[PDB]
Amino acid sequence: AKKSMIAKNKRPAKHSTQAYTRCERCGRPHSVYRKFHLCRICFRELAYKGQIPGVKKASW
Amino acid sequence: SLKKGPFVDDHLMKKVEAQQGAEKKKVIKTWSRRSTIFPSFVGFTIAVYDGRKHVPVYIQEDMVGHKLGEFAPTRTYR
Amino acid sequence: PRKGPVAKRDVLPDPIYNSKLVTRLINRVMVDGKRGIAANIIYNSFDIIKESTGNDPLEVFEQAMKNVMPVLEVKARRVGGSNYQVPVEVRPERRTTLGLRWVVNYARLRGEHTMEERLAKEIMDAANNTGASVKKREDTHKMADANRAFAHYR
């Protein structure tokens, strides 16, 4: 059903309290970093690929 | 908690004032889940939708405070 | 623990009477990272003690202590795999440990609505051999040598 849903958000919402966040490449509804617009796992992986400027692993 | 006046949706007000002249038609179907009760409603008969069926209920005097949704409970326990 | 014994973290002396024992007792009243309160009840109890029968907050303290610190202890050991409890030659330090432990704990149940009257009365009664802590040490010594017969050649 993910296609109808993904098509839903690209429109202007019916009311202001309806515009939520959802990953771009994948489509997770939950837990999307609204600084990057990635889901939880997609950012996890793409960090490995050296394609997000910034992010590394944090040891301290 | 709405000290800028109460609220009832317009597609019910116009449909409840339209009887103020003559007698009232026994039926006012609605959604019946966002409207408090105003003094202009006493004596009517509004059916109340519970997501499944509309529930016909009249209007008394003290039954004027709360919202419309407190008469068709969507629980059905027993 | 398993390899070998380990160090023991000695304390500093007190800023009034300069006693390692005094600090070692202040520590055994503190509850939940809150110290100053313990020092306050210690000092107030000490003054109360010195008030009636003024000799010293220290000397009568050591009197009550030597009234308490035991000399034996039942040490449950299954050399014969059974419920053998063998009287043990208690060490020096653990003696003081148990002294303070019995004193504070069993004094906590004395029952003065007042904050520190409980302690002061307890050690003052112990120095004169009246009170269950004295009875506690005597009970330990009466259960020791109550079975030293079959539990000594070990």
Binding site: - | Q60, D62, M63, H66, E70, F71, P73 | -
Partner: protein
């Protein structure tokens, strides 16, 4: 019997004892005493016959009685006899917000 409706104790502190009566919380006593101009006095109350009348007068300006319950009773009565889900669950105890009742009986009935 004793001094205001009923239910006043002896040999207590004043402001605390004035809360005892049904309907008087803590702010009520302090404001009442303010309108007389008094204090603790002291831990065994030793009021004067005039101060007693003063407080008996200033209290009779409050809806709080041995009768406040009648108003609450009739209010929940008007509730339970019109609709009323609130009144219906008030035949079985649920609040102004609900709390997903699968422990919310341990304060109302002792369910176990």
């Amino acid at each position: 019997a004793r001094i205001a409706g009923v239910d006043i104790p002896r040999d207590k502190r004043v402001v605390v004892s004035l809360t005892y009566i049904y309907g008087i919380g803590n702010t009520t006593a302090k404001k009442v005493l303010a309108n007389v101009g008094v204090s603790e006095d002291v831990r065994v109350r030793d009021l004067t016959n005039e101060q007693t009348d003063a407080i008996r007068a200033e209290i009779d300006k409050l809806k709080v009685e041995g009768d406040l319950r009648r108003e609450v009773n009739l209010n929940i009565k008007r509730l339970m006899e019109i609709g009323s889900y609130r009144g219906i669950r008030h035949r079985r105890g649920l609040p102004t917000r609900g709390q997903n009742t699968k422990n919310n009986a341990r304060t109302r009935k002792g369910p176990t």
